[PDB]
Every structure is written in structure tokens, then in C-alpha cells.
């Protein structure tokens, strides 16, 4: 409703870096808000794409941002009569970034890994990896829970059970308020998908450079399965956390599986021990239900609600014809111990191929009426196809069915404006929460500042 669409702030990165693929707000130890930006095709030392991360100080004018430096050199360790190898070429550092406390977590989902033992190998595969930084102190750490030292022949004998070689850990990420990092790895267990969790404090204290294979004892991974419904489901394509079991001492996980059960798609709510509490099934095959998940109380009852995006949903129209437009589903949490029901509200896109629902950002309370609101991206929506971000306001009964404000992309065609979103943080300290929007096609980030309601 009250985002300012006239005076925007633009940050930018190098051409072709895909600056803006992921972003988040970062508060330093003094509370000063900045913007961490992931650029997964930033060039490295060998003039090869490795990705990069930028930490943007808040300025109304915007402009260039200084780099958050990470190690980009390939590593090799000869230990235990084996040879461990990491490969950072085209790893995509900055394909997801998330901030918690004064720590930044940036991940390279396609970092490759291999182990050589004489003529045998583990196979060069994308286990993924995440890099952690404390910018004020310069502390660095890494976390790569899918690296293993099992040889290829073994997996074949055991029928690829517990095969974490293609995890792509860090594909999606989130940190609990208590400080537990939770990585989505949609390629884990031979493309079923797994989650990896470990406290940030223990990631730092258990990491030493050059070890490559180290134990994080406090970590917790999800479980493999023989059920074909989970095969090729990409469990962990998206991840979020919230409170859904009524026990405030426990933190529940929301996991997106957009090709679960033969591309029907699913979203599951679990406890911290990966025991399944609920499962929302997709409505239509190949709609990619579960592509994006968002958790926020939208109706002001104190119970977190759930939003799920299906950007490829094909809406029925006259003459038995479908139209791919995208759809968002709102699930309101019922009072006490009860299952989430049918969706409370369905929001459906308008522009063909617009991919309404590709990203869903909690905004906090934008207009300051007591109800939290959301922003929904349609990165190829709008009457020109350049991309649109639509704001829907919370109310006593859920969300409004019509948008209160529509942001049209300021960038040229193909910018994928809105592919990444983040809100619910007041960056200029005016009392109103603001919205940062990524447009990795244009290698830029637009900042929308909220203003008093007119």
C-alpha cells in the first residue's frame, strides 16, 4: 500500500555476475542495517565463474558495494591414503544468502567434491558448501555436511542408499532464532532431498581450514527412504522455520518438495527431529507447488500461517483451455493441536508465463494496522512481461484477495525482477518496514522504502 514507487534506491554489481540472485538484510553488532547480496556468477581469480558475495552499506543513492571476501582456491588434501578434492569452478557462491545475528551465511550449492583412492574414486559430484563470515571480526568458517569419503563401488553394492554425493547443500537456507543453520539439499539421497542442520556456534568452533572432512557432532541430517513417492522430489528446494506445534520450546521446519510424488509437489511441516507433522499436497502436477514457502502470522492471532507458491499453476479458462500463470496458497494455523485444513485463500496470477508465486516475502506490518502483510513476485508478469511484485495486506480473516499496491519492474526485459525478495526490516529507521527486490538478470537490487500511509 505505502511502499514508495517514485524514489527508489538501486545497487548494482558486475555485468553477468547475476548480482541479486539472493539477498537479505544484515544488522551489525550495533544494529546498523545493510544488504548482503549474492552474485553466483561473479568471476574469480582464474577468470572463471565462481560466484561472490557483496555487503552493501545503506545509502539512499545506492551504487557499488564492497565484496565480502571468501576463499576461492581449489583445495587438495592427501590423508588416510586418499586424496580429497574440492572444486569451486562454477560453484555458484551466493546462490543463497541469509543473515543471523552478526553472521552471514553464503552458500555455493554446486561446489564439486571428489575423493581418490588409487584407481577408484568417489565421483566428482556437487555436494555443495556454505561459507560463514563474521564481517566485523573477520572470522571465517565453512560447512559442507554432504562431503563423504566412500568410494563409488560401495554405493553401487548398497543400491545407492544414503548417497549424499549430489546434495547441493545450501540450495536453500534459513537460520532459527536460536542460531541453528538449516540447509536445504534437494539432491540428497539420489535426488530425494535432505535437510542438514547444525548450530552456527558449533560450525565455527569445529572448523579448521585444510581439513575438508571434519565432524560437526551437534549436526542433524534427515533420512533416506525407499518410498517412490519421494523419488526425484527435490525435498529441500525451499525451506523455512516457524511455530506450528504449540510448544514454543520447539522450532518446526517447513520444507518444500516441488516434484514430490511424480511432480505433484508437496510441502511438509516437521519438528527438529524430521518427524512429519503435516503434509500439504500440490493441486496440479508440474505446477511446482512448494517452489517457495513463507511463514508469517497474517491474521493477527499469534499463530504463524503458511504460504506456498506454485509459479507454474495453469488456471482453467473458457473453452477447456489452461493458462500457466502461477498460484499462491494461504494456510491459516488452527487454534491448538489440529491439522492445517484446506487453503484459506488462493491467489492466482494474471499474466501468461508470469510465474506469480515464484517468491513470497513476509513484509511485517507495512501499513501499521496490526496485521502482517506479504509481497508476491511475478518475475515475468505485468502487461509488458518485465516483472511485477504485488503486495497483499493481512486482515482478521487472512489476506485481502486483491493487491494493495503493484510494483512494476524499473529494469529492462529479462531482469527477472522479483526472483528474490526480502522484507520486514526497517533500513532507513523511519518506523516502517522496507522491501528489497533482486533482479539478477539486470545485476541489480532495488530498495523500496515504506512511507506514512496516504
Amino acid at each position: 500500500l505505502n511502499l514508495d514507487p517514485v524514489q527508489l534506491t538501486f545497487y548494482a554489481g558486475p555485468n553477468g555476475s547475476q548480482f541479486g540472485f539472493s539477498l537479505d538484510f544484515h544488522k551489525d553488532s550495533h544494529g546498523r542495517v545493510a544488504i548482503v547480496v549474492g552474485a553466483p556468477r561473479t568471476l574469480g581469480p582464474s577468470q572463471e565463474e565462481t560466484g561472490g558475495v557483496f555487503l552493501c552499506p545503506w545509502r539512499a543513492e545506492g551504487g557499488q558495494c564492497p565484496s565480502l571476501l571468501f576463499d576461492l582456491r581449489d583445495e587438495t588434501r592427501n590423508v588416510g591414503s586418499q586424496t580429497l578434492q574440492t572444486f569451486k569452478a562454477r560453484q555458484g557462491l551466493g546462490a543463497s544468502v541469509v543473515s543471523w545475528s552478526d553472521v552471514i551465511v553464503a552458500c555455493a550449492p554446486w561446489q564439486h567434491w571428489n575423493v581418490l583412492e588409487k584407481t577408484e574414486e568417489a565421483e566428482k559430484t556437487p555436494v555443495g558448501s556454505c561459507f560463514l563470515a563474521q564481517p566485523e571480526s573477520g572470522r571465517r568458517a565453512e560447512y559442507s555436511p554432504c562431503r563423504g569419503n566412500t568410494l563409488s563401488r560401495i554405493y553401487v553394492e548398497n543400491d545407492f542408499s544414503w548417497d549424499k554425493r549430489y546434495c547441493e547443500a545450501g540450495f536453500s537456507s534459513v537460520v532459527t532464532q536460536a542460531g541453528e543453520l538449516v540447509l536445504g539439499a534437494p539432491g540428497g539421497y539420489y535426488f530425494l532431498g535432505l535437510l542438514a542442520q547444525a548450530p552456527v556456534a558449533d560450525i565455527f568452533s569445529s572448523y579448521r581450514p585444510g581439513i575438508l572432512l571434519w565432524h560437526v557432532s551437534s549436526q542433524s541430517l534427515s533420512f533416506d527412504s525407499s518410498n517412490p513417492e519421494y523419488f526425484d522430489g527435490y525435498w529441500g528446494y525451499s525451506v523455512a522455520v516457524g511455530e506450528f506445534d504449540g510448544d514454543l520450546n520447539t522450532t518446526e521446519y517447513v520444507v518444500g518438495a516441488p516434484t514430490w510424488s511424480w511432480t505433484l509437489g508437496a510441502v511438509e511441516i516437521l519438528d527438529s527431529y524430521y518427524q512429519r507433522l503435516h503434509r500439504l499436497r500440490g493441486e496440479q502436477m508440474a505446477s511446482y507447488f512448494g517452489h517457495s514457502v513463507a511463514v508469517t502470522d497474517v491474521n493477527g492471532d499469534g499463530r504463524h500461517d503458511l504460504l506456498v507458491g506454485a509459479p507454474l499453476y495453469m488456471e482453467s479458462r473458457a473453452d477447456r483451455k489452461l493458462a500457466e500463470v502461477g498460484r499462491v496458497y494461504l494456510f491459516l494455523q488452527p487454534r491448538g493441536p489440529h491439522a492445517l485444513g484446506a487453503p484459506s485463500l488462493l491467489l492466482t496470477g494474471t499474466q501468461l508465463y508470469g510465474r506469480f508465486g515464484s517468491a513470497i516475502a513476509p513484509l511485517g506490518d507495512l501499513d501499521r494496522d496490526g496485521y502482517n502483510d506479504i509481497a508476491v513476485a511475478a518475475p515475468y508478469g505485468g502487461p509488458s512481461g518485465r516483472g511485477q511484485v504485488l503486495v497483499f495486506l493481512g486482515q482478521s480473516e487472512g489476506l485481502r484477495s486483491r493487491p494493495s499496491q503493484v510494483l512494476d519492474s524499473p529494469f529492462p526485459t529479462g531482469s527477472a525482477f522479483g526472483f528474490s525478495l526480502r522484507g520486514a526490516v526497517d533500513i532507513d529507521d523511519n518506523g516502517y518496514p522496507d522491501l528489497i527486490v533482486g533482479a539478477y538478470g539486470a545485476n541489480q537490487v532495488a530498495v523500496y522504502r515504506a512511507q506514512p500511509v496516504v
Epitope: R77, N78, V79, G80, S81, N149, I154, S206, Y207, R208, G210, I211, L213, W214, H215, S217
Partner: antibody, heavy 119, light 108 residues
């Protein structure tokens, strides 16, 4: 806290066998490698072998191929070392070891089981 | 196998002295070495792993260094508890192999 609690001292005859035990305390035995080391006053320290209790695969120094047999039961959270056809030279103190962070290290140690072979 | 030549076999030193144990391998092991401490009539405790990294709980007066096939353990200001046996162990290759050991004795 990580503690490796081994079995009591053994006192056996030559030609017989003995099965030492290493029970994990404060952690799951399945988490890391478990090794076995043999100590003697003159000969010093010697590496027997290792096991990954998650899958049961083992590695051995070829000097102990035949006598040493390392197994692991994740149920009782315990690792075992079986010694066969015992000899006066099998009189030694035996330790079970696991690493702290590095996959390949030797950081945490049990108290050690004393073995004595004699007729 | 890899032969770990640890020297000296023993040393007579006093409290507060800064001493240094060394360990020489038959081939390069690229910092894949650990250091161990066995107090008299007791079990082992881990001091160093990967050549330089202290095990959790070990005081900072201990420090490891070196590269290639030559490494060193150093104790700055000896404590009355540091008088014990010390061993090096390489894990660059299986089988793991240990050093001969070094006994710190009280000088008088």
C-alpha cells in the same frame, strides 16, 4: 562429554581368544571412526586397525591380519576387538581411539584394557 | 610404511623451561600429524591434530609446527603436570604409525 569406557583387564592362556569392548559415553559410536592401538614398553605403540560403526567396514595393518578382528554393534553403542591364537607377545595394553573433528585423527582415547597371556 | 623418528628419547628440564620435541617422517606427510600425552600410569590425551591445531581443552602453552617431513611440539613454560610421555603419530597413509616417544624428566 566424550568418554570411551573399555572393558576390564583380561588374564588368558596361550592359544585361546579374547574379545575386548569399547563402549561410547556421551555420544553415538556411529558418529566417527573407531581405532584400536596396541602399546608395549619395548615395542611402543602400534596401530591395529579401524572400523566405521555406521557400515562395519574395517581396515587393518597387515601385521595384525589374522589375530585382530574389529566389530561394532551400534545397538549397545560399543566397538569390539577380538584377538585369536594368543601369544606371550599379545601381552599388551589395548586402547580404542576416535577423532575430535578431523575425520582421520586420533584425539580421544579410552583408559586402556590390560591383557596378559600366560600358562 | 612411514617411519616416524621422534627425538629426543628423553630430556631433563625444569619448571618454566621452554622445550621442543621433534618428529621426522620417512616421507612428506603435509601436516597430517598429531601429538599425544600420556601422564605416568594413565591413559592418553590428545594435544595437537593436523600439525598445529590444539585439541579442545589443551592449554595454549602447547603449540605444534612444521611442514613436509619435519614437525615440532613446543611447550612454553613447563608446568609440574607436563612432565610425562609424548608421542607423535602420522595419518597421511594407512597404516597409521607412531613415534618412539619422549619422556620429560625433572632436572636436579
Amino acid at each position: 562429554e566424550v568418554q570411551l569406557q573399555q572393558s576390564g583387564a583380561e588374564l588368558v592362556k596361550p592359544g585361546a581368544s579374547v574379545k575386548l569392548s569399547c563402549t561410547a559415553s556421551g555420544f553415538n559410536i556411529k558418529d566417527t571412526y573407531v581405532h584400536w592401538v596396541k602399546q608395549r614398553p619395548e615395542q611402543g605403540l602400534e596401530w591395529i586397525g579401524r572400523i566405521d560403526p555406521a557400515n562395519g567396514y574395517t581396515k587393518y595393518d597387515p601385521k595384525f591380519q589374522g589375530k585382530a578382528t574389529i566389530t561394532a554393534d551400534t545397538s549397545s553403542n560399543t566397538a569390539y576387538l577380538q584377538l585369536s591364537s594368543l601369544t606371550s607377545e599379545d601381552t599388551a595394553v589395548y586402547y580404542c581411539v576416535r577423532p575430535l573433528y578431523d575425520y582421520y585423527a586420533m584425539d580421544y582415547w579410552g583408559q586402556g584394557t590390560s591383557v596378559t597371556v600366560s600358562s | 610404511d612411514i617411519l616416524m623418528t621422534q627425538s629426543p628419547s628423553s630430556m631433563s628440564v625444569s619448571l618454566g623451561d621452554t622445550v621442543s620435541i621433534t618428529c621426522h617422517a620417512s616421507q612428506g606427510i603435509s601436516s597430517n600429524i598429531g601429538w599425544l600425552q600420556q601422564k605416568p600410569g594413565k591413559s592418553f590425551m590428545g594435544l595437537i591434530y593436523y600439525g598445529t591445531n590444539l585439541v579442545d581443552g589443551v592449554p595454549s602453552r602447547f603449540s605444534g609446527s612444521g611442514s613436509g617431513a619435519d614437525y615440532s611440539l613446543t611447550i612454553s613454560s613447563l608446568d609440574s603436570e607436563d612432565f610425562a610421555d609424548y608421542y607423535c603419530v602420522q595419518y597421511a597413509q594407512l597404516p597409521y604409525t607412531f613415534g618412539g616417544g619422549t619422556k620429560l624428566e625433572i632436572k636436579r
